[PDB]
Amino acid sequence: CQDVVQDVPNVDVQMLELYDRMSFKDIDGGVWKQGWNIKYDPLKYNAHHKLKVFVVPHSHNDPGWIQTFEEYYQHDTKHILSNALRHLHDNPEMKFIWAEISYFARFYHDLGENKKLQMKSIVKNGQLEFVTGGWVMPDEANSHWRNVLLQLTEGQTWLKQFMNVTPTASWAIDPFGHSPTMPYILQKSGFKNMLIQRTHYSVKKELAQQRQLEFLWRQIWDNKGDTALFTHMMPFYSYDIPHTCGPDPKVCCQFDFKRMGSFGLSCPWKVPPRTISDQNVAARSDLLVDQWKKKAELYRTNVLLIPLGDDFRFKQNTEWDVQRVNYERLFEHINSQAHFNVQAQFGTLQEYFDAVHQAERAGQAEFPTLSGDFFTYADRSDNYWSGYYTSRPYHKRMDRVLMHYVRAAEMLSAWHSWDGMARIEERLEQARRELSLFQHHDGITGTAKTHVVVDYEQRMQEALKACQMVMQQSVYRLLTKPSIYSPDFSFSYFTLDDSRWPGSGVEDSRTTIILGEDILPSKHVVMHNTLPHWREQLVDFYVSSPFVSVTDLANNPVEAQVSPVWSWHHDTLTKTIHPQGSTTKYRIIFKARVPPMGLATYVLTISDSKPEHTSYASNLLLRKNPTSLPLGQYPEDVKFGDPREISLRVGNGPTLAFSEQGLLKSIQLTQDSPHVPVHFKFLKYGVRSHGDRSGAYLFLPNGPASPVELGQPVVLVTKGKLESSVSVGLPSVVHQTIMRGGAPEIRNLVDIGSLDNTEIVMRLETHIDSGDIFYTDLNGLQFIKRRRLDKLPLQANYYPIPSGMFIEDANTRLTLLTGQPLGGSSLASGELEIMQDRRLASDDERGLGQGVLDNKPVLHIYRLVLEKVNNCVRPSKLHPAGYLTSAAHKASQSLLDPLDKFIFAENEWIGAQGQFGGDHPSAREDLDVSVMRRLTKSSAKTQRVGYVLHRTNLMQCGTPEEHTQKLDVCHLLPNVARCERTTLTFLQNLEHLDGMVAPEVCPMETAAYVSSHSS
């Protein structure tokens, strides 16, 4: 295994180093506004050395943006694909590439068999070529790597089944900045080449000057280079025709033959296209070849890529004709005039890359190596696209919830083969496809129109219901005596109970367990643990009595805590935000212990008085002017006081001190250690009153943030043996700090209400001497070193925070883990900040045509980990990566993959069993079974189960921490007959494994295995 910590890779281009050196000046480059006037030597190409030009027709089809998926399908995409089939069929030299398989699958299934056969033939013969082959072209900033893999798999599995092809070239022309998670996944999925476009204009200029726009992109920790993937970065401002023929858009627009008038389009540079004729083809070809030769100066081989397309292009038959016929005339002229020394033709993306690598092999070019990322993107001036790291945060959080429910549903149902009448495969396919769709670069990004956001949300709600159905059917089967099991595949044996989605204050969605002497004495509940190690976690349920005790299913008592059910109210009469307690429902909390990838059953029983093993939290309401707070049968009376500082400690865990406004001020890790200053603060950013306005994409603040004016907020302190918390009703945020004995959990119920032109940020202020350095993650996969650059504006120093961020000095680290992707930064030494929501009246001129005024309450969740790191073995000062500690990684897992909770729906569960998975191996803490998916339906004689295994890398800090068992996924199901290593999509076998044993993977590696079973 390669060492991912101690060896700094030697690469030609390291993006953090590049950023430190670059000046980012925005000077007028001439017709290439962000470049320079490109010069070429006419004598470079000659009879013995021609320029080979591939013109690649394409159509960018957004799966929702200004219209919904289905609206675009009906109005645009079905016509594009129908006319592509016809025109490619009838014109054998024409070519076309296709990226978004969600649309292609929608189309193909509606085709008659004769047309399906015609479509298969133009794919098999190379005229129609799939590029990437994902369900979508995903966002790269907010997306979790697990969902990037999910959607890639969904599309490529479809393509293999129906088109008998698996793309090896990727096309990503529109995500708003680019992540190295993409080459990581793609290279482990059979890919050989990828293309990107939206990178900062200053990066394009710098790389173009050095001819470093084609590079071998490796991961930041990869010393050897085995992760490298050949990458082409496009050089200009857009993927549209004006910005793809060459550096002068006024010239290139004249070669977009859809712009002459009849189609409703024109050229903003005020020179229209003109139809190619024998009388103008020489002058037109002079202009076009000169653009091509200039573009070619930015690259190292004699093979040139010329994309030809734009959004929802190639719709009408007349458009196919006008582009094809005019380019054919140009090619006929150019290719017959030796003085140009050009051979130009329609091509596909794979054809381009094949010819590039033939030139490389012939010794014509050597390519540089590169590591790093391409955030934060700016397309022009100071217009940095950091807004969409936060826009529509409700749906960003929903993404992470659905991520986990898909994994849990696929895992729980994989243990068995299911009859078709159970509808398991059907529900899982629907769930995977709706989540996959949302990875689109107008879905999770929060950059679609209001009604499109609603469509995504409705789809994801259906997907959540599908997952719940599959999960509860699976639990019933896994925990019922087999000779008793009598399923009704339409019935709800269990309901899921989720304490954090949609969340307290967002939706009253949770069912109360109703117990009583005259109705029902007890109730079974079941917890699932999708992680491959034993896990303890506190779990809570709502119950109709405070007099409830917990037992395991050997009838052993389990210690429990009961707390009130508190609801925060924005009281329009008193003009205060204050909590009310229920007088009929209560929370019971207890520690569940659950096997690896397993299930554990508990029983909740009512009694007439306080049970022996159940304790009751105290409650203290700090406010001037209190009024009473009755709690029904709850046995401890609420106490009141004036606002004051408070301190709390649960178990042997840290001691946390809070201001009189209910906000953390210090953390003391152990009883004799310092009270380390750690202060939470809420602030607001505004919008500029002159110049460019923030919108769904762009963050254009009117200066540094200003503190929210808190007044004298109401603070609720709940103190229990198992769980304590401090909650405060601030303007726009009910902020909660929850303590269970380790790092606290932070929950913010964020309701930005009618605050127009406001962005609410949560900041942490510490005295950690972090200087200008901080760390953020990429797609939940890796942590990258960031350096704050005062030569760039504030918004340029914002980065995606898809799952966590940290700052550190020689001795101390503060890590904030998230349950949702949000934007954030460290704008000063010792600070961390993360945006909660943004409400923006204006459009930001990127095509959306609306502001962001559809905010709704969202429950954001976090873990806050303060640690001593002086004993940790860290990377050297020049290494571009960082790594979590064990405690921070487990805290992240606690947010993203919590225990699942199931409440038995009927009065008696006949045949109930106490546990599943007690014999599953408990794997080392850095290893995860990211995916477990049965790949065959029940009719297959040989069943196949796929696993994706990911090993992270955790710092060595002196904890001896060992004894675990080896996890061999190929023996998790009985009767194994073969074990194979596969690509991550499961679509290609890479190695037949001796002994049918799946080895574990190295740190920072991800592997896939498929086990086959004879029985």
Ligand SMILES: O=C1N[C@H](CN[C@@H](CO)c2ccccc2)[C@@H](O)[C@H]1O
């Ligand atoms: O958010 C998005 N931005 C892209 C914008 N495409 C460009 C045309 O190349 C466009 C800009 C403005 C209006 C319409 C279209 C869209 O593809 C969508 O994904």
Ligand SMILES: *[C@@H]1O[C@H](CO)[C@@H](O)[C@H](O)[C@H]1NC(C)=O
């Ligand atoms: C699938 O494609 C391969 C060629 O890449 C071929 O060997 C096999 O026959 C194909 N099956 C078909 C044609 O459906």
Ligand SMILES: [Zn+2]
């Ligand atoms: Zn797009």
